[PDB]
Amino acid sequence: TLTEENAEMQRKREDLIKLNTEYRLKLKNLEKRLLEELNNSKEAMNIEKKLSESEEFFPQFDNLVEEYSIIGKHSVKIFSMLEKFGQFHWFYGISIGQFLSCFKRVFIKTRVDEILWLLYQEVYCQFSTALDKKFKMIMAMTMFCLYKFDIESEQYKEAVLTMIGVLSESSDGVPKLTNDDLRYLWDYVTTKSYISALNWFKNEFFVDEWNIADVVANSENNYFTMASERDVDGTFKLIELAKASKESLKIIPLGSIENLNYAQEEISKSKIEGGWILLQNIQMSLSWVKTYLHKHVEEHEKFKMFMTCHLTGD
């Protein structure tokens, strides 16, 4: 935030660095001049004045770091339950440098309210494409709670908690409502269409939901992991997407050693000259993948490569 969000913060940081360098250079020049004068027996004032002028920056820095603290607490909570989903299942891992990159993208894409809303929407659309639908709406309602319970009063919070409780069959009670929305919410929960209530909360807050094409388009990497349950398969959907993307997607199911060698040759060719390779059901030769693909991973453009795994698998 200090580096990029405000040009004043970075310009005073650079000014402090330049003032320190100028003071050191002036001290060295004064020492050399004193040695020369002893052997033979303006700039320092300007540097001192510049240092004294730049010393009037601590209250400004304190104000800037204080004004951006609630967003920091929100980010800590966001990372908290993002990492907590990594413990519920073995398929919801969340990185750290990826979070740094997505914050940089938020900077690239009431100033405080606007920037926190932008962070919420962009981090949600970049980090919620790695969950199944029920856990996606769990993320939706948790993030909606962290937004609303901090930007709204606590009577609205109590109303939301008692609506979640009657949704969870934990309690029954009339909420202390305070418009045209919660009346429709009570109409839905009296109609008992629960997924309609969840979709109504979503449409009440969420305005955009990234699809598969956008999430595979908004990336500069060449390695992608594709996951689906055993009752679903986006392989032919990926063929249709690649046809829309005018890319040659060459599906290779794993299997016998000849199939593994063919897949290795094809991905070598696709790294050499480009192309799209969809390794169907990479759980097939799990150890072969875990050795060969890991060794290959650990630079040609217009090359994307996908995995394929299953939820109830290895």
Q: Where are the alpha helices (DSSP H) in the chain?
A: 7-39, 43-54, 58-67, 70-88, 97-108, 111-127, 133-151, 154-167, 180-191, 194-205, 212-217, 235-244, 257-273, 286-297
Closest CA to 307 of 212, 225, 223, 216: 225
Which residue in this structure is represented by tokens 């060449």?
Answer: 222
- DSSP letters, 204-256, are HH------HHHHHHS---SEE--B--TT---HHHHHHHHHHTT--EEEEE--S
Residues contacting 300, CB < 8 A, separation 6+: 271, 272, 273, 274
Closest CA to 265 of 227, 229, 296, 239: 296
Q: How far apart are CA 51 and CA 45, in angstroms?
A: 10
Q: In a 3-state reduction of DSSP, which class is residue 82?
A: helix
Residue 238 zone, left/alpha/beta (φ > 0; ψ -120 to 50; rest): alpha
Looking at the chain, the residues that come just before a C–N gap of over 2.5 A are 41, 109, 178, 298
Q: How far apart are CA 196 and CA 28, in angstroms?
A: 73
Q: What is the resolution of this structure in A?
A: 4.1
Q: What are phi and psi of 250, to 5 degrees?
A: -110, 100
Method: cryo-EM
Pairing of strands 249-253, 275-280: parallel
